[PDB]
Symmetry: C3
Subunit: 88 residues, 3 copies
Amino acid sequence: SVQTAATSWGTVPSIRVYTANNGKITERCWDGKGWYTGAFNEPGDNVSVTSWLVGSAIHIRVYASTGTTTTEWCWDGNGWTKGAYTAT
Amino acid sequence: SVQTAATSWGTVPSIRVYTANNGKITERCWDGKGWYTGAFNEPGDNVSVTSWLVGSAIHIRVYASTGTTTTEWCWDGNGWTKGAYTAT
Amino acid sequence: SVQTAATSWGTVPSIRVYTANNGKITERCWDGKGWYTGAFNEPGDNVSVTSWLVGSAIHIRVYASTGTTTTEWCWDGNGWTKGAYTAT
Ligand SMILES: OC[C@@]1(O)OC[C@@H](O)[C@@H](O)[C@@H]1O
Ligand SMILES: OC[C@@]1(O)OC[C@@H](O)[C@@H](O)[C@@H]1O
Ligand SMILES: OC[C@@]1(O)OC[C@@H](O)[C@@H](O)[C@@H]1O
Ligand SMILES: OC[C@@]1(O)OC[C@@H](O)[C@@H](O)[C@@H]1O
Ligand SMILES: OC[C@@]1(O)OC[C@@H](O)[C@@H](O)[C@@H]1O
Ligand SMILES: OC[C@@]1(O)OC[C@@H](O)[C@@H](O)[C@@H]1O
Ligand code: NA
Ligand code: NA
Ligand code: NA
């Protein structure tokens, strides 16, 4: 089936749910006023996520895997880019 | 194999582990005095979870997927019910 | 594909990413100064993780599944050992 990963922050809360579906990962977002589609859209058959909230900043790391290759995607307030994570 | 998702809260801690096994998701609970089977029992081949603790209340969201359909299940102090989450 | 699970703590942060790959789970670690391979290495086709930081101590629980058997692995400051978790 499709595979999901979820994270949340604050007291509203904000929630992000990532779904790997047919080789593509997309993102659904809740910030207290309805679900919507987020900016994250990257290839992958499997996804995990962690996040940490510091002051006014959310930091999100999404680990997207295809075959044996895992790419880390980073949100630090200014869009998604690949992070330095490698498998070894 | 079976697929799991885990969350925890507080300092005891309380832990919840969800297992998707043969199309069914069940829940195991730890609150500091042994593991036991929780109330959550719903269909699904894949599961993710997030939770947030506010004051005296734990809020849990479990994302259960079968095929391309994902159902959000909500714990907000009074049993599990379906939440408003949709895939798009 | 390979399957991952991730957790993080503090403000640096520390991040741990577990990868189930070809029946083996390994661990990659970030503590603010580069990624490295952690001590965790155990069998499994699926992995989930949760952690909680209390005072100066991180507690990590990794749920490793092969077939219908799930083993809980515990980090409480002194290496990884099997925990009391059972499926029922
Ligand atoms: O619009 C909300 C948003 O900016 O929140 C932070 C990230 O989850 C982004 O992908 C997302 O688009
Ligand atoms: O600021 C981005 C970054 O340094 O954040 C910490 C880790 O996620 C790294 O892999 C990543 O490159
Ligand atoms: O008995 C403990 C319990 O009420 O804790 C909150 C939820 O995890 C429930 O499914 C569970 O049954
Ligand atoms: O109180 C339930 C609810 O509003 O909580 C926030 C989100 O999980 C929603 O999808 C859900 O319907
Ligand atoms: O070296 C860092 C380390 O000790 O951090 C705690 C655990 O994640 C361990 O597996 C890991 O080796
Ligand atoms: O100290 C280890 C332990 O008691 O921690 C809480 C739970 O993870 C238990 O299954 C585990 O045996
Ligand atoms: Na992944
Ligand atoms: Na799911
Ligand atoms: Na598992």
